[PDB]
Write a structure and sequence with these properties.
Blueprint (H helix, E strand, L loop, with lengths): L5 E11 L12 E7 L5 E3 L10 E9 L7 E8 L7 E9 L8 E7 L1 E2 L8 E10 L10
Antiparallel strand pairs: 1-4, 1-9, 2-3, 2-5, 5-6, 6-8, 7-9
The structure holds calcium ion (CA) (3 copies) and chloride ion (2 copies).
Length: 139
């Protein structure tokens, strides 16, 4: 290639202020990550029965065009006797992240229709050139 080929490294750290998504429980949250409308989707594990889940899971997503790519983060509640319940989502433009910076930030999610509040999610995001160590700060 005659241009840089960037990688999106994302740590899904934790969430807070989640809504009650179960009549007899609290929330069993997991997060789904999707670049643009890609068929490669990533999902975290489920953290049962808490409004403040901690996942600390890392994902590595090749980028097509840092000037236009978007990362959608979608929170859902796992259920056992019914289908999972959508909670909230945020679409994050990749072009807002300085190349090579490790950015650790909280994000407000937008609740889906019918959900009272969307929560916040903490993501550590690092746009780095191909081969660079994920989450390694610039030197
Ligand atoms: Ca539920
Ligand atoms: Ca549930
Ligand atoms: Ca359900
Ligand atoms: Cl609620
Ligand atoms: Cl930049």
């Amino acid at each position: 290639h005659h241009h840089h080929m960037y990688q999106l490294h994302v740590r899904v750290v934790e969430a807070k202020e989640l809504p009650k998504m179960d009549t007899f429980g609290k929330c069993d949250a997991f997060a789904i990550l999707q670049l643009n409308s890609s068929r490669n989707i990533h999902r975290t594990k489920v953290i049962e029965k808490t409004y403040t889940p901690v996942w600390n899971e890392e994902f590595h997503i090749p980028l097509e065009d840092v000037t236009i790519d978007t990362l959608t983060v979608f929170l859902k509640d796992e259920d056992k006797g019914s289908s999972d319940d959508p909670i909230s989502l945020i679409k994050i433009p990749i072009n807002q992240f300085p190349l090579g910076e490790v950015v650790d930030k909280w994000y407000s999610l937008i609740p889906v229709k019918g959900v009272k509040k969307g929560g916040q999610i903490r993501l550590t995001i690092h746009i780095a050139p191909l081969g660079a160590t994920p989450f390694q700060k610039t030197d």
